[PDB]
Design a protein around this ligand. Structure first.
Ligand SMILES: CSc1nc(N)c2ncn([C@@H]3O[C@H](COP(=O)(O)OP(=O)(O)O)[C@@H](O)[C@H]3O)c2n1
Lengths: 294, 218, 57, 338
């Protein structure tokens, strides 16, 4: 029994949910209306699909958190809904990294064009990463065969076998490594993109400064969103994994551990409705399409 | 169905060839030249381009293929064919620095031409590579003739550095967008591999913006 | 001479273009309607033909 | 001298205007109330010909109502098979700037031209091997607006030099020069008898021209803006002119009158292509509002909408028998409607 304020917490999600339910919807018809011109379009479509899946998983999570029995709904949420939410969020991370890589390639190598073979390869890579995330998430959904031993508690860390627990720890370590690699790649590529734009501007325009800061203020928005909403989750993920798998942390530490982990999880889930907003704020064509829709 | 199969095979081969040609065309850079006949437009062509209404000039610089287009021979209405230049990488506008007092002034005629080109519905997102050529002649002509006769708005003193820098700013204020179109201004010189060097950088700058506009960064 | 030759040509053309015989607009409208009704049956655009003999199905 | 000539021209112009007003006793719309309107017409995209990679500007149908030809800014002129949706031919163009596209009545030659002032006519037979250059007419100083084949040995080209040219394929040189316009020409169409063709320029007038003599028959100063779309009625005694002020005006030859106009509040954009039907009851026009309209030539009301494109329309075509309609709108795509 952490606190009664637990009931207050999924309310944020539904405040996060309803608006999200329309934002991805706004991105559902606009992003898919245009054809697959380049790899960025495919990656953005996959990202909005992942965000829609996040929105689909949210009401189950809020129902489990607010008030629900351990048996009928908590086991179902912890078995598939939670795991699908996690690997879809990892897929969104990977596709954000792919978008950053595509932008870096388009900036550093501007003369290279996107061929049909390049689009086919990008689609193949998307399918491969989707299948990879599904394959790693499958044991996390099939190894939770243990029945709930206790009905009063809602923590589903005991609903998993010893091999299930060791595979869960391996999955956490692998996904932490993947996230760190993707984060460093994104940071490096965005810094290189800003440097390349600055160099191009000083080669062409010279000592101008007014439009040079326009790209700096928009790149930082992506960096800020990817930092303040993904990174604290992975700072707090390792202690939570150690507490769930091992017993190295004591009882009173579990309260603040759960609090910070769940708050960081909410911050991560905010990205589902944040990504449509930032992607519409960045590209002017998306704003034009949204205005024409109204 | 042998005839149908042969027709399908021919269509597939034609489609492959057309895709290859389209890739080759998209890899190359298209630039449209605009301005006046006596503004030094032909001076830029006869610099390093070793390789009848349109004068097509093709040259390779740093493993990049360019395609210049000249519309000087088209002595007709511009708006009936200016829409055919959609998707060009940039517009190379050439205006003479020394043509401020030739007579209905030459500078006013170029500004009126530049105003229509820069503020038309066809080149809203197309950058302009402005060229203030013939800067060498501008040095010995600024002292004899000031800019007061062209317009009384020049409160500043008449100097080669001051006038050339200020007359450069006389073209950006004509741009109403100032967000989708960026005007790149350069003064032509006789230095080897220096005038075309700016064009390569200007093309790279607009392409980078174009390569990121569809990528969501703009 | 050169500044007036084109004017003379234009006025002569406009003068001799008015010597043609013109029929009433009602007769022309009647002929147009008659031609429209004569080929109305053999017009796929006016009458949507069945897909059986339609080469674009 | 000049003042006297100007005064005489103005006097004769007002005299001819008074004669035209006296000739118009009853308008077409006043007597059209007897015929039953066709009503709403539904036309769907049967074939989507997606082979081009640039903005298509012109096309033309063959006399066989099956084989067409299209021109875009990719430097490729594509002869399409509309039946099986395949590329019969694809010929490179030395100039990517092409705005005209004509197809020979016998189907052996195809012409293309544009900003290069040169009309290139290529032989579609080429039994000796690959396609090759056949003729290159270079006598125009304008952007070579449009071209139309009279036969295998005569082609009429209207250009941006305010003049029209009738050429000969065998000789390769201009034969007849049409000099009546005051503004540059944008489009022209040939009559079924191939003896009297109308031409539209940007001086808000449509002028008739005879193939043999070359003198101007009639002039219609009906519109108030530049005319860029024009086509003959199937009988050959009427035609339609489309301007950029959302105005399509029908002009009769023998009547020599402004007959009826497509003035509507919804349309405010320009017009690019105008065609007719087999019987001429349907007038298919293309507007800058990203879709094509199909008006009733008699009832003066709209009957169909071809909203399938996502860009400005540039080329419209209707077969001789009216079997199908081809639409191409700046999107490298052709759409077939029935
Ligand atoms: C590739 S999908 C994935 N990735 C992780 N890093 C994960 N970390 C934990 N999970 C599983 O996510 C669900 C709930 O997360 P946990 O933190 O392990 O348990 P709770 O604190 O009750 O939410 C369980 O089914 C876990 O097996 C994960 N699933």
């Amino acid at each position: 029994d952490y606190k009664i304020t637990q009931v207050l917490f999924p309310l944020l999600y539904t405040v996060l949910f309803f608006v999200g339910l329309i934002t991805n919807g706004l991105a559902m018809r606009i992003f898919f209306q245009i054809r697959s011109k380049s790899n960025f379009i495919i990656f953005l479509k996959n990202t909005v699909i992942s965000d829609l899946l996040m929105i689909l998983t949210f009401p189950f999570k809020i129902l489990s958190d607010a008030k629900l029995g351990t048996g009928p709904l908590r086991t179902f949420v912890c078995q598939v809904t939670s795991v699908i939410f996690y690997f879809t969020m990892y897929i969104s991370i990977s596709f954000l990294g792919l978008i950053t890589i595509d932008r870096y390639q388009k900036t550093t190598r501007p003369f290279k064009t996107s061929n049909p073979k390049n689009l086919l390869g990008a689609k193949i890579l998307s399918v491969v990463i989707w299948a990879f995330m599904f394959l790693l998430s499958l044991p996390n959904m099939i190894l939770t065969n243990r029945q709930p031993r206790d009905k009063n508690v809602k923590k589903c860390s005991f609903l998993k076998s010893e091999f299930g627990l060791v595979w869960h720890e391996i999955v956490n370590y692998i996904c932490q490594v993947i996230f760190w690699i993707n984060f460093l790649i994104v940071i490096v590529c965005y810094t290189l993109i800003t440097k390349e734009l600055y160099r191009s501007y000083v080669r062409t325009r010279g000592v101008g400064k007014v439009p040079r800061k326009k790209v700096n203020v928009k790149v930082f928005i992506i960096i800020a969103v990817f930092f303040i909403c993904f990174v604290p989750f992975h700072f707090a993920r390792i202690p939570y994994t150690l507490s769930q798998t091992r017993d190295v942390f004591d009882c009173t530490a579990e309260n603040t551990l759960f609090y910070v982990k769940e708050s960081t999880l909410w911050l991560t889930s905010l990205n589902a409705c944040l990504d449509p907003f930032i992607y519409f704020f960045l590209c002017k064509s998306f704003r034009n399409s949204l205005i024409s829709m109204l | 169905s042998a005839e149908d199969k042969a027709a399908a095979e021919r269509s597939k081969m034609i489609d492959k060839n057309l895709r290859e040609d389209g890739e080759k065309a998209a890899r190359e850079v298209k630039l449209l030249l605009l301005g006046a006949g006596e503004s030094g437009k032909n001076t830029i062509v006869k610099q390093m381009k070793i390789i009848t209404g349109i004068v097509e000039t093709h040259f390779t610089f740093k493993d990049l293929h360019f395609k210049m287009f000249d519309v000087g021979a088209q002595r007709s209405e511009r708006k009936k064919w200016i829409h055919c230049f959609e998707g060009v990488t940039a517009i190379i506008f050439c205006v003479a620095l020394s043509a401020y007092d030739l007579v209905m002034n030459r500078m006013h005629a170029s500004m009126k031409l530049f105003d229509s080109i820069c503020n038309n519905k066809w080149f809203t997102d197309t950058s302009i590579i402005l060229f203030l050529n013939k800067k060498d002649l501008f040095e010995e002509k600024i002292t004899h003739s000031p800019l007061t006769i062209c317009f009384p708005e020049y409160t500043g003193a008449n100097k080669y550095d001051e006038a050339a820098s200020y007359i450069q700013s006389k073209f950006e204020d004509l741009n109403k967008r100032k967000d989708t179109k960026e005007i790149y201004t350069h003064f032509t010189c006789s230095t080897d591999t220096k005038n075309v060097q700016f064009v390569f950088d200007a093309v790279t700058d607009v392409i980078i913006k174009n390569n990121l506009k569809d990528c969501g960064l703009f | 001479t050169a500044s007036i030759a084109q004017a003379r040509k234009l006025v002569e053309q406009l003068k001799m273009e008015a010597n043609i015989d013109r029929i009433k607009v009602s007769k022309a409208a009647a002929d147009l309607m008659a031609y429209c009704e004569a080929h109305a049956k053999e017009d796929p655009l006016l009458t949507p033909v069945p897909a059986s003999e339609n080469p674009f199905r | 001298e000049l003042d006297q000539l100007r005064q005489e021209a103005e006097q004769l112009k007002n005299q001819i205007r008074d004669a035209r007003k006296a000739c118009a006793d009853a308008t077409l719309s006043q007597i059209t109330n007897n015929i039953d309107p066709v009503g709403r017409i539904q036309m769907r995209t049967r074939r989507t010909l997606r082979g081009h990679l640039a903005k298509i500007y012109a096309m033309h149908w063959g006399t066989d109502s099956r084989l067409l030809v299209s021109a875009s800014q990719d430097g490729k002129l594509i002869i399409w098979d509309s039946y099986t949706t395949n590329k019969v031919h694809a010929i490179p163009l030395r100039s990517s700037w092409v705005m005209t596209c004509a197809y020979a009545p016998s189907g052996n030659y195809v012409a293309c031209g544009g900003l290069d002032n040169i009309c290139s006519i290529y032989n579609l037979k080429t039994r000796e091997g690959n396609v090759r250059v056949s003729r290159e007419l270079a006598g125009h100083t304008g952007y070579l607006s449009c071209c139309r084949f009279l036969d295998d040995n005569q082609i009429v080209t209207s250009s941006g030099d305010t003049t029209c040219a009738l050429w000969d394929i065998e000789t390769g040189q201009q034969t007849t020069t049409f000099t009546g316009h005051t503004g540059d020409v944008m489009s022209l169409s040939l009559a079924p008898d191939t003896r009297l063709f109308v031409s539209g320029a940007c001086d808000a007038s449509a002028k008739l021209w005879d193939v043999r003599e070359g003198m101007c028959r009639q002039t219609f100063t009906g519109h108030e803006s530049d005319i860029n779309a024009i086509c003959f009625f199937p009988n050959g005694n009427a035609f339609a002119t489309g301007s950029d002020d959302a105005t399509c005006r029908l002009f009769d030859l023998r009547a020599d009158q402004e007959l009826m106009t497509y003035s509507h509040d919804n349309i405010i954009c320009g017009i690019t292509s105008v065609s007719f039907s087999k019987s001429g009851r349907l007038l298919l026009a293309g507007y800058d509002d990203f879709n094509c309209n199909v008006w009733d030539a008699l009832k003066a009301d709209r009957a169909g909408v071809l909203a399938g494109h996502d860009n400005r329309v540039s080329c419209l075509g209707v077969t001789d028998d009216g079997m199908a309609v081809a639409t191409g709108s700046w999107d490298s795509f052709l759409k077939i409607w029935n």
